[PDB]
Amino acid sequence: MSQVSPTRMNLLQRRGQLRLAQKGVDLLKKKRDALVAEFFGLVREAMEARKALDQRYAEALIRVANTETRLKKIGEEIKKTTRRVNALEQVVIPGIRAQIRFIQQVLEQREREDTFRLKRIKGKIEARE
Amino acid sequence: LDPWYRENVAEDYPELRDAISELLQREAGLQEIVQLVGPDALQDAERLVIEVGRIIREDFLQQNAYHEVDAYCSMKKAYGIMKMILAFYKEAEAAIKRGVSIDEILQLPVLERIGRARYVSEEEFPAYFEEAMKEIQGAFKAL
């Protein structure tokens, strides 16, 4: 092609990665939100569970993991194949903008400079004649 | 030319075309971003704008030169179709703001009629406005 490719190209590129960046800080905020509901779950868990061991006392047990199991249920696996989700995702995504960026500039390289050896050759024919 | 339209056709001609153009303008920006980060992260509000933006393109911008009716669209018909689309927009944004699923609006029965409005040669078209409002009410009912 030629001109026009010129600017939508890289604002797909620039404006479009300014907001891929921005999903990046979004998800480390989630980071800090997620990891803090992570350990506390953990807490009572460890907890009256073994209140279960020395055991009625039947619930030091399911009382235990109704608390214990629930908390780490949400937190434990909802909390991250979805956490490790959020962030494992959007980064092969600044991969897009990344090497694919090399893409736009070998592309752009190729011709505002090539298109010019040329406006000037033709000058050159009866520019020289 | 806005005053000719305002005095002879419709008082809201300029405001309507500015509003539709802002719709199309917003769609263009949204599609550029979606080209990058995909459409999965899109909020309901942004999906609604694409839904109505698409209706503008298909139901208004597109005209069939080969159809005996849509080959020519009288001034009176142009504004009436515009108000059906813009009224569907307002109702769409209003329904979303009240937690109506966009999927529920996307399959709203009146939509298919709005799509064939360019083929109607009678004002039966402005009746679609009332047909749109009651239908949204049936969506305000089911919640």
Place this chain on the structure above:
Amino acid sequence: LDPWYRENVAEDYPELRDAISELLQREAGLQEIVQLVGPDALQDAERLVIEVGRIIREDFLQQNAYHEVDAYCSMKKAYGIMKMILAFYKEAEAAIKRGVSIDEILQLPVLERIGRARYVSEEEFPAYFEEAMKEIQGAFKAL
């Protein structure tokens, strides 16, 4: 130009600037990673490198062209400030290796003096080296 500095100013000019540059180089790499995974996972060793890297940037790289003193920094003053920073680095890494909290080093009293060293027009600056060592000892004391 290294030999001119080694013979006329300081024998350790080249080694000192290479060491500071490696510091700045390491900081750059660390900041890139932190931009991704956040700073919460950072070990004390990595937090210390950022702490000293920051002191290099603020206390050395940055110079005030508007200050009557820091407007020009004589060769003799440049190396002396470098050795105060590099000596604080060695002591910092040495203290961490002995389980001294980085938070304890970050609020070390001498640090504020190192920060205003560029404003001193007297060698009172190399005295900061001994002031740094004893202060770390007071941190080796409290453990």
Place this chain on the structure above:
Amino acid sequence: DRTHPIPDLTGYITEGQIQLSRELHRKGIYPPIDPLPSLSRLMNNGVGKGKTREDHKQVSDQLYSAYANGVDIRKLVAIIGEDALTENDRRYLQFADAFERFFINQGQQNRSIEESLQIAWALLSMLPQGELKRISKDHIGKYY
């Protein structure tokens, strides 16, 4: 094309540049000034005490910073949803609309610099005072 040789060679002859953009005009923002391509190539020479007002540079800096953050947050809203935005970010998001509705938009109308700074301070109130990084405390106390 701002790189065409004519407009491109003209930039050096100016002390202030106001760059208008079709994209911005198509979003209904008028005047359609690109806030990240308009420069006081010479702005600092025509502002301050004895020219406009002492707080002019600080207000201009703060509005520019807040509007730029607010525009980026429009992208973040699209990414995460409006409800997932923090309270602080929501204020910056809202500030961008306020800047466009009240500062950029004029109902054709000759605003004095005093009028323009007043609108600027009025919209700035939407932001937390603790978030006015680019306005020295002396100006906040005197003008906020």
Place this chain on the structure above:
Amino acid sequence: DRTHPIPDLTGYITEGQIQLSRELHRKGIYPPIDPLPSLSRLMNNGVGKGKTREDHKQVSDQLYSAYANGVDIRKLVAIIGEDALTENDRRYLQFADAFERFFINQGQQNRSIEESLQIAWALLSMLPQGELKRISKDHIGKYY
């Protein structure tokens, strides 16, 4: 730009090319030779039994192939993450670092061809023996 008409037309005039790369130099690898873009046109005329050693071509072929695979895998690591790489690919990834650290890098030092082949075989040990497609079994038994 290696495609500029000057460097590009020069390639045909050579029997050996050593291509240096800024990217490699910026990683601190000196000499900054691109191991997948340096070639020998007349190389086969100066190697083998009675010149260097009989396994020279096989070793050169295997190192070139493994280094090229290892460099591509640096791209794959960026795409998927280090932990998602297979055990076999991880070995090739590591081989690329070993090739750069030990074979390319010389601490200024005059290596005999025997010394250079020895380093080559030492780094090749990092790869599974079953993955040495370009070295005949006769050479593996005699030299590995």
Place this chain on the structure above:
Amino acid sequence: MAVIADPETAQGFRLAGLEGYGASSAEEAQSLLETLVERGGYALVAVDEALLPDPERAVERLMRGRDLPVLLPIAGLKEAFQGHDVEGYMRELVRKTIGFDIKL
């Protein structure tokens, strides 16, 4: 939900009304996962971590399936509680996320 734990504990979850199944090794326990998975009705299987030291390899082995039970290592056997399983489950979960084996 099912729970897989050492036999004494498993018995106690049963007396509490829950669906506890007893095992005494990483392998035995993986077997139990596969029988449950094939048998079909569970949305979640909570497993003493002493019995599930590698839960990714665990998924890996279960199947050519089909929609899986979430698989949740929690800590064990009697002496496996009288640790704290969690301090280290937490070290792994933060490294897991941010990438950073943080100095806890």
